[model samples]
Target chain A: MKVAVLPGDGIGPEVTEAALKVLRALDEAEGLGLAYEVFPFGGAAIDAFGEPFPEPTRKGVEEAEAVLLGSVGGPKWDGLPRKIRPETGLLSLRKSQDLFANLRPAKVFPGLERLSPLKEEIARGVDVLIVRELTGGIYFGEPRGMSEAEAWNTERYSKPEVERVARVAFEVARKRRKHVVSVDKANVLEVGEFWRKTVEEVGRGYPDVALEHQYVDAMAMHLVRSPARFDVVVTGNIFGDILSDLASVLPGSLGLLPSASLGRGTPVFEPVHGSAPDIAGKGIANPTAAILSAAMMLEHAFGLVELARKVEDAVAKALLETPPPDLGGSAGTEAFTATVLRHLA
Target chain B: MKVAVLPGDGIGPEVTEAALKVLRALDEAEGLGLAYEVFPFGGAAIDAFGEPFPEPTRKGVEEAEAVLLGSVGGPKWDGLPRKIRPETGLLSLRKSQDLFANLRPAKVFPGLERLSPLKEEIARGVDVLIVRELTGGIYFGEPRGMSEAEAWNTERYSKPEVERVARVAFEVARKRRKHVVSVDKANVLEVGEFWRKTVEEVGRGYPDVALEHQYVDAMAMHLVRSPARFDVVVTGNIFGDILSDLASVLPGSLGLLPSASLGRGTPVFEPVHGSAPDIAGKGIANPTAAILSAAMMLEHAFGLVELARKVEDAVAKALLETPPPDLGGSAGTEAFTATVLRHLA
Candidate 1:
């Protein structure tokens, strides 16, 4: 299987290399067929092609079965023209790839409950998965204008957009604990009512998966109060943005989380952290999330669930013993990678 | 001072009575003049006037200097027509009064750290205030509609609205820890940029209050991770809904949180909890939030900060002695109110 690796900037390349080492080591030991092609993306592409994204990068990643991308952008590129800015480039890539569903899993491991801000009884045994409909929503909708009279944006979700994402959520639930809580603001917003209806219709397709609905406000409180009760959470774009970020903190540091997006073409995988310009080559940036994203790439693109679980469990086991520098345990990226490899060994 | 008291339904009336008792006792002892005119609203309004809200109620509240409203709605009115629904009635009151800014304080009391879902180390000594622009943003922005292809809503803010709200935040910070964090999605959304600019310009008015900016996504994580670092958090409509609700739990029990909304007219004060139907007449419902709402009315609407502090301190001492039944302590509504009044004495 071909995997396009786009190590964008700063600590992105360093973390990508560490993830590749783990993936390559598994390929040799377990016959997990994998091939990698690193492509120039983000800031590098801007330097080479004078565009934050180049046609060549798009074509190369689209041809691959899956794409693994590290974090992009930094303060140095912050003042560029709006369209060519790193954030705009990132949004364009997702749209170009038709990436519709964003999957973020937040699970508090057994031994690291102390790392969480939540009380022990509340934070222990917390495992939640958020499936966000990425491609459509207010942020990407039309007629978003600013003016002296007033500024307004639209939050629209076609039945098809909501349906496809809903199906993905149920499918995710079938593989997990078999429970899905659809979050929306149906009580107030019409868009929320439409989303709730479409999601419920899709639930019929997966009868084994249990379904429940919660308002976005209530869901926010429930996520903080009793996160362990939720298995798979699905919502529209903007709501998902806030909720997914809220869920990420359930386990403590935001960098520990990994995300992957599904679209018509090759899916894209990435860590939940941005490029660390402060410690670019200090070798102190945590690579745990990057490695975890690789595991997601294996599972989602290649359907290698067993191998993915092996990688995930190894990381968890390593974290259970000692955290990386980000979490105050002082093991640099390389040392942390060695510990995971030893566990895999 | 004339006060319109709309004790709508269910636990709303119980809590309102408990709050009124404290207000009346204070009036007698300290000569803090407050005359209440009870108005029918919510489910009761529907039962008495055949509509969830009546014209008289609106007129009454408008003419009053301030309003103290109990929670509204119950399952009994769940099937009412949309326009005549209890929820709609509440929204109409907010509109009629032109209520624009929502004030929600999230403070962790000394004896209540164990009640929070957050660990004692993180949950203890936490205090934060979120100033939400209630009347504007995606929820109220125009051109919101659904069709065969899409659904849309607008998120618009102008210079005047942002300026007024920003002034309110700084005004709030002066009485708080003198720090404010303006949360928005400035990097991606142009509206966020305008909001930041407007809030910053207004910041010049209050040179003593420190100002900072944070992205909404990052704010969500930081709120859960380090809420104590913040004093007053100001944001647009929808972001405030999620963050205020998220902040509601930092103190542990949702029912204990009190809220107030400011607008062109008298501000509306209420507890964060809804009209809890299950425990309506049991006389065992918690009154701490209601009593706290009374304190808010004294400070925000009447400008009696010293008297408000007396009420606030009394509640704190009572909570230190015995939590309400809702918090797993055995004291009921009257008993809790007695303890607070004893402290006040």
Candidate 2:
């Protein structure tokens, strides 16, 4: 399988390097034929080709079966115009790939419950997968603009938009907990009602998976109060954006969280944390989130479930034995990767 | 001063009755000369007048200086038509009174920190007042409907709508911690940008108050992680709905939380907890939320700031001295009120 790697900017390069080291080690051990190519992306692409998402990088991603990306955007690109910004490059990539479904899994590891702001009892045993619709909802809706006196944005959802995301949730649920909670504001918003009904219709196809509906407001409270009770939560773009970020912090550190954006063409896996420009050259940035994104790509893109689990287990063991700076341990990015490599061996 | 009290249904009567006892005692001791009249609302209105939010009830609220409401809605009225449903009655009352801004205070009383779902350190000093714009936003936006293939709702905000709510937030912040954090998704949504700019303009008028901006997603996570950092948080309708509900859960028990809806006409004060049909007439439902709502009315409606503080302090004393059932103490509704009355004396 051909995989495109985009080591974007700042701490992105450090973490991406660490993740690539783990992937190469896994490939050699498992005798899996995984070919990798490096492509300039985001701020790096701007420096190289005067455009954030250049033609060569787009072609590279199109030909690859899977894409592994580090965190993107830094203060260096903050002054760029909307069209040529690093953030815009990310949007271009998503739009070009038709990546509509974003999967963010928030799982609390065994020994790190104390890192969570939630009471240990409330934070422990929390493993929730938030499947969010990416391309639709209020963020991308039409008739969106601002004037001097008024501003408005539409939150629209079609049957197909709701169906495809609901299917992703149920299919993922079947692989894990077999339970899905569809979150919306159905009681108040008309679009919310439509989304709920569409999800229910798609849910009928998966009898083995249980489905429940929850209002977005109630879901926000439940995620904090009783996160362990939830299995898989699916919602529209905005709710998912908010809830996924909420769930990401529940595991205590964002340095260990990974996300996968999937749709028609190649899937893109990336860390949930942003690029830390201040800590770019320090070599102390945690690489676990990036490494875990590689694990997701292994299972989701390459169908290497066993190897993915092995990588995840190695990361977990290494987390306890040699913790990273983000987790309040002294280990640097390279030291953490070395520990993970040792565990893999 | 005249107050219209609506003891809606279920534990509504019990808790409202409990709050009335405290209000009456305060009126007598403080010589506030507060007069009260009871009005049927929600399910009780359907039972007594054949419709919820009857003409008499609407007139009573309009004539009174303030309105105190117990929890509304029950499963018995769930099958009612949308127009006559108990939930619809609450909406009718809100529209009739034009109660646009909602204030939900989530404060953790001393000695009950362990009751919170968050850790003791994180939940101990949490005293956040969520000022939510209730009348507008996506809930009542124009050009909203669901068709066979698609559904759409507009999230729009006019300048005047944002100005009035921002003023409420800044004014409230002046009396509290003198800090206000305006929450929005400005980076993504046009409405969010408009809201932020409008709030910043309003905030400039209150030079003594410190103002900050936060994304709704970050605010949701921060509420869980470092709630003590926030004093007053203001947001648009939908964002506030989610964030307020999230804040309500942090203080551990909804039974002890109070909410107030303020606008051009009579402000409505109510408990954050719902009417528990299962515990109706059992005399065990917690009355702290309702009593605190009464306290809010004292300060906001009648300008009885000192007396409001007295009621709040008495409740705090009673909570520590004789804890309620929701706080894991055996004191029932009447018993808790008696304890509070004794503290008031």
Candidate 3:
């Protein structure tokens, strides 16, 4: 299988390199036969070819089986035209791949739950996966315009959009605990009512999955109060974005959270933390998220669940032994990677 | 001064009675001459007069100087039609009164920080006031409808709406830390762009107030991490709803939170909690938020700032001396109010 790697900016390059090293170690030890190509994208490509998504970068992603990205953008690329801006690549890539379902798993590591903002009882034994419906909703809706008197954006959703994401949530829930909470504002918004109706209709087909409903605001409170009670949660783009980001706290440091955006074509995996331009070249950035993201690519992209579990267990083992700098330890990217690789062996 | 007291349903009457007793105590001791009409609103009005906001209730509110609401709605009123439902009174009231700005203050009372889900240091000193535009935005935007395949809601904000709320935020901030963080999703949504621009323009009016902008998602994360850094936050209706409810955590117990909705007409004050059907007649309900709501009416409605300060100080002294049952103490409504009244004396 071919993988596309885009170490887009700042600490992106460093983290991606560590992920590559781990993949190489796996290939050598388990003979997984992973073949990948590295390409420039985002701000780096903008500086090189005057376009965030250069021709070669587009072709590389199109031909690859899965994509592993570090991150994109910096303040230097901030004022560019919206069409040529660094974020354009990501938006265009999602459009190109039809990547609709964004999954963010916020797992509180066994030994590092103390780092979370939650009290120990609330933080312990927490594992939540948010399946967010991207590409639609108010963010990408049409007929949106604004003025001094009024600015308006439409929050629209269709049966197909809700169905696909609901099924994805249920399908993913089957992999863990068979519970899916379809969150919406059904108590208020008509769109929410429709989204809830469709998600419930979709849930009926999956008899093994248990379904529950929660309004967005109440769910926000629940995430802080009882995050451990949920297994899989699905919601529209806006609520999903807010909630998954809120759930990021359960794991303490965002630097260690991994995310995936899956669709009809190749899926894209990346760490939830951004390119830390402030700590770019010090080699002090945490690479655990990137490495764990690679493991997700292996499990979801390459269909190697056991190998991915092994990779995850190794990272958990590493954290149990030593906390990284972001988690308030001295272990840098390479040092943390070394411990995970040692455990994997 | 005329005050409209809406003891709507369930625990609503219980808590509002507690607030009124406190008000009466203050009136007897200090000769404040508290004159108010208790009106049947929300579910109570629906049951009595077949409408949540009957003509008498409407006329009563129209002539009042200020309004204090305990809470609204319960399971018994759950199946009521939209027009007759308990919540409709609030919507109609806001519309009729032109209550454009909703202010929700989340302050951690002294000695109750341990009740927060957050670690002590993070939860100890949080005092944030959110000035949210009440009447408009997605909740009441035009052009909203739904279908099996498609459903929609519009998020709309005009310059006047943003400006009014921005000024309210800055005007209120002068009383506290003199900082206002206007939150939006300008990076993604057009309405957010309009909101940020209008808020910035309004900031020029108050040179003493410092202004900062934060994306809604990022602000969600920051609230959990640094809630104490904010004095006042202004945002659109939907976002304000979610964030204020989220900030409810910083105060340890949401039952201790009070809010006010202001406009050109009489402002409305209420507890930041629901009717709570389960705890409706338990007699063990906490009354701090409701009593504090009365204090807010004293400050914003009666313009009795010193009396409001006294009421707030008394509540703080009470909380420091004896924790409420909601905060893990055995003190019932009167038991807690006795302590607060003792402190007030």
Candidate 4:
């Protein structure tokens, strides 16, 4: 398998380096013939080729079966043109890849309950996988216009659009809790009702996995009140954007979360946290999210299910022993990765 | 002042009766001379007549300076025709009154920190007033279509529509902490951009009140992580529908929350809770939400600001002394109302 690694900017290179070391060890131990190439992306690509997501990097990503991204953007890229900025590069890359489903996992590791905003009892054992429809919905809908006096946007969804995403959610749910909660506002919006119907049709295929529906408003409340009740939550773009972020914070630290974007082309895995410019070269950046991103890539891209679970277990066990700076410990990125490597069986 | 009171289904009558008694006590103590009449609505009206919102009730609601409503709906009315259902009646009533701005206040009483889903430190002193654009946006937008292949809904907002809701938010903010956070998805949607622009223009009129902008997604996260950071939050219809519910649950119990809908005609006051048929006529239902709704009516409908504050303080004091059934204490509805009355100066 050929993997494209985009070590983006700021602490991206550091975390990418740490994650790569772990993946290399796994490749050697499991006799997996995995070859990888590094591609400049985001601000790094701007410095190397005068533009983010240059031709070389695009070609590199296209040839690879999977892409491991670190992080992107900084205050340095904030003043650049919108077209050439690191953020735009990331967006264009996802568009080029036709990535339409975003999977965000919000899990609270043991011994980290005090860090959560929710009570210890509520935050404990909270593991929710949020599958969001990325490419469609109101964000990219047509017939949208704006004027000096009024403005409008459209929220459109096709049966196929809802079907594909619902399929992705159930497939993912089958691996976890065998339960999926499809969130929408069917009672009010026509698009919402259509979305519900399409999702229900797709759910019929996965009879083993129980399917339920909830209003976005009610889900928002339930998420705050009792997060443990949810296992796999799937929704359209805007609702997912809001609910995913809300759920992300429940685990207390953004630096500990990972995300994956999947579709027609190479699947891209990345940390949910951003590139911390302030801690870029200090060797103090937390690499758990990046390492976990690699684990997700292992399962989703390479179909190395057992290896992925092992990698995740190692990270969890390592957290109980060696704590990172973000988790209020003094271990550097390398030290934390080393601890995770030690826990690997 | 003539007030129309609709003690709708289930525990609605129980809580409404308790709230009206508190209102009557205030009428005599403050010499406000508030005269009220009971009107059949929701499931109660459906039982008495054939439909939920009837001609007589419509006339009664329109003739009054304000409307006070109890909870609506029950299991028995769930199978009725959509047009004659209790929920539909409430919707028609809001539409008939042109209630466009919904104010939902989520406050944590002093002695109820343990009941909150959030940590005690996080839930303590948390107060947020969510001003929602009730009548506009995607919920009622035009150009919506649906078919077997696809479905779509438009989110359209005119400058005047944004201005009216923003004005309501700012006016309410002036009475509270004088800080307003206008939430939208301006980064993507054009209508969101228009909403932000119009709100800024409205903010210019109220120079004393500070205004800020937040993306709906980020606001959703902040509402859970640091709710105390917000005072008054204003947003469009769908965003409000999700965020307001999220905020309403932060205070621990829906039975302690109150809401007000303001518009061109008579404003409507109601508890944030439901009919709760399981506890209907039990006399064990918590009446705090309804009593607070009456307090909101006092301030918003008749501009009885001081009296409203006094009533609210009395409720808080009473909660400290007499715990309700929902709050884990055995005080019945009348007993709680008596405690509130004793504390009312």
Candidate with the greatest DockQ versus the true structure: 4
Chain B, per-candidate TM-score: 0.95, 0.95, 0.91, 0.97
Regions more than 4 Å wrong, model 2: A277-282
Residue pairs with colliding backbones in model 4 are none
Give per-residue CA lDDT, model 3, range A1-345, as digits (tens).
699999889899999998998899999998988899999989999999999889998889899999999989989999988999988888888888899999999998787778888888888989899999997899998779886577889998888888898888998887768899999999889998998899888888999999999999889888887889999999999999999989887777878888999999888998887777999989878888899899889877887878887898898888877667776688887888899889888
Task: Residues B138-165, candidate 4: write the lDDT tens digits.
Answer: 9889899899899999999999899999
Task: List the pairs of residues colliding in candidate 1.
Answer: A119-B118, A119-B119, A151-B156, A153-B153, A153-B154, A153-B155, A154-B153, A155-B152, A155-B153, A156-B151
Best by lDDT: 4
| Top-scoring candidate (TM-score) | 4
**What digit string (tens of lDDT, one per residue) describes model 1 on residues B226-299?**
88888999999888998998899788888889999988887899888888898889988888888999999988
Ranking by TM-score: 4, 2, 3, 1
- Candidate 4 Cα misplacement greater than 4 A, ranges: none
Estimated TM-score per prediction?
Answer: 0.90, 0.94, 0.91, 0.97
What is the C-alpha lDDT profile of model 2 across B6-67, one tens digit per residue?
99988999999999999989888888888989999999889888788999899999999999
lDDT of 3 by residue, B191-287 (tens): 9998888888888889999999999899899888878888899998889989888887677677888999998887899998898878878888888
| lDDT against the true structure, each candidate | 0.87, 0.91, 0.87, 0.91
The candidate with the higher lDDT, 1 or 2, is: 2
Cα deviation at B229, candidate 3, in Å, is 1.1
